[PDB]
Amino acid sequence: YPAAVRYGVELCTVLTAEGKFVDERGSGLSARCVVNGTGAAESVVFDTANCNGTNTTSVEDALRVAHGALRSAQDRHNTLAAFRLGPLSKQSQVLLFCGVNAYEFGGKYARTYAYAFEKAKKELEATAASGFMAPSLSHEDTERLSDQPTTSPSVDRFASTTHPEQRKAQFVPRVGPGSTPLEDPAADQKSEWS
């Protein structure tokens, strides 16, 4: 489904539609413009042969004619895109509204999805107040222990919280670059520099 909707919103981006507009002010001058999709600007043309031989046409009138042509072409392109996407859009809506149970936000995890959305919504303002600096993804700026939620990676999961040599992820402790203690990082050797 996401691939299909991406295809649908991408095809009409490069597809284009042509529109026409004939001036209603009595002058026979018209404007024909082929408008593109999202980048809604492509070739335009004026036909001065249609108008009378007087050619007493104002530049403001020409601008109005071009505006009408662009508006007509854009609404035609929008209608074409709507016709292209409608038959698949209805089926997608039916699928999403019916097979909700087989989704992350549909079944018993709907409460989880709501909780995650609320937490992100609330933490956006916290990040904004902290200056858009991503305030310690690993929760360490929490002045209180009860402040950091239970989903943070900061809370330890190793057995024997007071005994070393058992706070290891694998069956044997491992060393990274050189001989640093990768398994249990110390405060000094971890840094957020650049």
Binding site: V172, R174, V175, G176
Partner: peptide, 8 residues
């Protein structure tokens, strides 16, 4: 890849 101490 992270070597263990017994290699060192």
């Amino acid at each position: 890849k992270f070597k263990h101490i017994f290699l060192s």
